[PDB]
Design an enzyme around this catalytic site. Structure first.
Site, PDB file in Angstrom:
ATOM      1  CG  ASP A 273     -16.093 -22.004 -10.629  1.00  0.00           C
ATOM      2  OD1 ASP A 273     -16.954 -22.683 -10.124  1.00  0.00           O
ATOM      3  OD2 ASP A 273     -16.463 -20.633 -10.608  1.00  0.00           O
TER       4      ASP A 273
ATOM      5  CB  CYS B 246     -20.699 -33.079 -14.799  1.00  0.00           C
ATOM      6  SG  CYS B 246     -20.083 -33.875 -16.115  1.00  0.00           S
TER       7      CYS B 246
ATOM      8  N   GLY C 278     -17.187 -35.262 -18.460  1.00  0.00           N
ATOM      9  CA  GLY C 278     -15.753 -35.018 -18.152  1.00  0.00           C
ATOM     10  C   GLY C 278     -15.778 -35.565 -16.310  1.00  0.00           C
ATOM     11  NE  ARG C 279     -16.363 -30.486 -12.761  1.00  0.00           N
ATOM     12  CZ  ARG C 279     -17.139 -29.358 -12.216  1.00  0.00           C
ATOM     13  NH1 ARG C 279     -18.203 -29.285 -11.720  1.00  0.00           N
ATOM     14  NH2 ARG C 279     -16.428 -27.998 -12.561  1.00  0.00           N
ATOM     15  CB  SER C 280     -20.258 -37.740 -15.587  1.00  0.00           C
ATOM     16  OG  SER C 280     -21.428 -36.933 -15.026  1.00  0.00           O
TER      17      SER C 280
ATOM     18  CD  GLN D  99     -15.686 -32.036 -20.507  1.00  0.00           C
ATOM     19  OE1 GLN D  99     -15.741 -32.024 -19.155  1.00  0.00           O
ATOM     20  NE2 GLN D  99     -16.301 -31.483 -21.452  1.00  0.00           N
TER      21      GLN D  99
END
Length: 284
Positions: free
Chosen positions: A181, A215, A220-222, A262
């Protein structure tokens, strides 16, 4: 400069925030006028994350062709990706319309539906075989065929039917379920294993349309997923793998979608993933 030495240099000097801010300063700025039209306000999850006009994916409909999604086209690596936001209640039919029209084989999901007690994207696929989903605005039917649940990811086989023509296609859903998280993973090992499972399926290969990766905001994660994949492929292809410059690759990708990676923590994690992944690509 070998990135592994660059990494220790940055880490000992603790300058990750400074490196990341340089990237933010040098990143491209292109117009995103279609995203900001009033008729599209409920098609965007976040006010400050929009596709550039020059690289946005267009829906094949005369009404309104807008979706918050971008085509990232990597010329030297010979890979393309579609990066998009997690679908909203009003855009789940648009999302599957794009998957259909772009001839994608795979969808990569890097978030959970609820995180930090809030909804991060709609429940956009069916959870039981006998309870299929129909998207009336775009005339598509989606059925769960099978599900394989593992400790760090789940892979689903789905059937998408164009109800106008009764053609059907198999879509693979690759769902990484264990990103924390807050922050980034401590080890890149499970993220790299996941990337290799997507590769082995064919979903990233030129005989299909571009993979769709998302995401919550799709940056970010992507961004971490596509940056790691492209850098490892370039290390495969070049005579000198130490010539691959992850900061230069990231700035090339940011020509096609704003904001990729990010935080300074995500930048460090991307370095770590590429460094550890190379100890399969180069012959270990």
């Amino acid at each position: 400069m070998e990135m592994e030495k660059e990494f220790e240099q940055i880490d000992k000097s603790g300058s990750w925030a400074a490196i990341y801010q340089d990237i933010r300063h040098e990143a491209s700025d292109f117009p995103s006028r279609v995203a900001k039209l009033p008729k599209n306000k409920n098609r965007n999850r976040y006010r400050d994350v929009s596709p550039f006009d020059h690289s946005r994916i267009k829906l094949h409909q005369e009404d309104n062709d807008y979706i918050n999604a971008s085509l990232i086209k990597m010329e030297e690596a010979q890979r393309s990706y579609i990066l998009t936001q997690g679908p909203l209640p009003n855009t789940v039919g648009h999302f599957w319309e794009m998957v259909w029209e772009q001839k994608s084989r795979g969808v990569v999901m890097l978030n959970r539906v609820m995180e930090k007690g809030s909804l991060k994207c709609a429940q956009y696929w069916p959870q039981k075989e006998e309870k299929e989903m129909i998207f009336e605005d775009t005339n598509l039917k989606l059925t769960l065929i099978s599900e394989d649940i593992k400790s760090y990811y789940t892979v689903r086989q789905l059937e998408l039917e164009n109800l106008t023509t009764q053609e059907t296609r198999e879509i693979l859903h690759f769902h990484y379920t264990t990103w924390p998280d807050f922050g980034v993973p401590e080890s890149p090992a499970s993220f790299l294993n996941f990337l290799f499972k997507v590769r082995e399926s064919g979903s990233l290969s030129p005989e299909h349309g571009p993979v769709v990766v998302h995401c919550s905001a799709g940056i970010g994660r992507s961004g971490t997923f596509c940056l790691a994949d492209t850098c490892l492929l370039l290390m495969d292809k070049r005579k000198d793998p130490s010539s691959v410059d992850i900061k230069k690759v990231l700035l090339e990708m940011r020509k096609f979608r704003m904001g990729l990676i990010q935080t300074a923590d995500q930048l460090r994690f991307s370095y770590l993933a590429v460094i550890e992944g190379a100890k399969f690509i180069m012959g270990d």
